[PDB]
Amino acid sequence: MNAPDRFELFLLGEGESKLKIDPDTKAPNAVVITFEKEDHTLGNLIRAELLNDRKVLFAAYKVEHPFFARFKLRIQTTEGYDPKDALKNACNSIINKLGALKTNFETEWNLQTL
């Protein structure tokens, strides 16, 4: 009866935009990104990758309530480094790793019988 449609988990509803970049007020060179229609699959993966970057000082994600998909990603980088750039590299790093894994599996799969 009061159940939201299941498409509302992965589908942006008119007005909602994927990313929302809000500059953090508490810390310098810190930003807060609101990802709409996303969850732990992207939140954890991106946050865990940002940690591998030495110029990244802070990286944490949270899903404020389970009812809604939206998560929040806080990034604080060193002076000179734009947190948006750190997010970009984190993403590219992931895709490169994913690309490699795809080929590696395909190569191994083709050696197999049954």
């Binding site: 009866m1 953090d24 994600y61 404020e64 009812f67």
Partner: protein
Amino acid sequence: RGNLMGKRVDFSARTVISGDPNLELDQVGVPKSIAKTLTYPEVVTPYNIDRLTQLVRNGPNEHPGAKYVIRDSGDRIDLRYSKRAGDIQLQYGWKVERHIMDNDPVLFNRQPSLHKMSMMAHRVKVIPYSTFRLNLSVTSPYNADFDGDEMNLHVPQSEETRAELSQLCAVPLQIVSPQSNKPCMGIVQDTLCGIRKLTLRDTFIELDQVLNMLYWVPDWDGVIPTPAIIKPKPLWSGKQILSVAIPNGIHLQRFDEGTTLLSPKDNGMLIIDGQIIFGVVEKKTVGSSNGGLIHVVTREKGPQVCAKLFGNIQKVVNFWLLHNGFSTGIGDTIADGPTMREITETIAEAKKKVLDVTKEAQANLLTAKHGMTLRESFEDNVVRFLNEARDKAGRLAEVNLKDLNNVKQMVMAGSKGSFINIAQMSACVGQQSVEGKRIAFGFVDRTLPHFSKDDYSPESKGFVENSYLRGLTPQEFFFHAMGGREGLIDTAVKTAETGYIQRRLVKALEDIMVHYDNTTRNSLGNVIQFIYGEDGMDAAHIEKQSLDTIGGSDAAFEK
């Protein structure tokens, strides 16, 4: 009684309740359908006209919308019907019966309303799904659980009526209760269990998790505290990260058993400038306790800050615990082989002590003390022996439970269970009673037709030697069932009896209030007390304090 003192009312709602770890203490989860039903009459002023026109455009089926527009004639325009429903151009002085929106003060209630705390103003949070959602720490004043319970919501219709709720009846204002001059809300369940676990000396957390826990606190200053460890890897202690939830200027000192400022057992409590120095955080600290972290925080920083404190502690602990986990299985009721051997024989010597007193009674050697029968003194002894037995066997079991034992963990946290629970589940259920006496001879000279006549043995008169783990025998079962039945009859009687008592008390004191001369009078103006409670102090603004002149030796006073 049914029409004047109380009556059926408009702007009311009712549903099944649910717990929400992500809702604020003073908040209430309102199903969008309910929000869409219940309305507030808002007058058109230049301050709101822009919002109101948009809400009127949204109509009765979209949430931040409305149903009915009242004009300077008193005629309602039904927004769900009406040809001009999408046409309406608002005028000042007109009222708009808008839907219930986020942050509206509403009166939340759970029956029976035995308290002023069974009715509290909450901040609306319009949410999906069919249940009313509420913060777990608001559970106790309401005396609510989530096993099918239903709660009532009332909507103020006046500006002054909504002021009364927000300024008098609001949840944060109700934290420290005048009933027992202590807080009436504290940290419960998962949060209480997890907070102990998180707060141990062994509990250390790494950067990746720390930053996640840090970010979870909304108030967070954005400053990463320096780790307690800077050796091969930075490692933050549990106490450290939880201290982020505690505001600055918070001081708390306790002392438990062997607490010695060097707290060897990690007991007692020491919080300085809102940094937990030592001591495991449990019920005495974080519960609804008299001198607790909660009582202190409300008195020091204020209700609005203390209400926020529930959320911050909840958010960290719930998160840490979600990633730690906590369970309970049949394994946590299992006591060690050697322990059972002791338990079994502890009961054997008890059975023997009883036989000996029986044999003594039968030999006419037993002598009763003044005031009681030889049989009354006998029965008194047998029961003493039989209770000692259960208590000894239970202590034998509790001692054997490892710090990793989940039931022990819950008891230690103060989240659930007590000694008896451990005792009855793992060691021995014990003696059963009906009318304060052991199982009576319902049949002529016997408890059951499986026994012979004139049998006063523990087994014969309802002593459950076995634990719930081992299992009860048919005799033990039936006897425990007789004890249980008595408990249910009493429950049904107590619930009724106390209800009538409550009504009488309320009716007899209705009209007593503190007048403008600090005096306590009734509707006739008759004096009941010249100074309220003999000091003219409000009960919520009072706390247990030591009078340092009364005690100690004469020399110690002098020194």
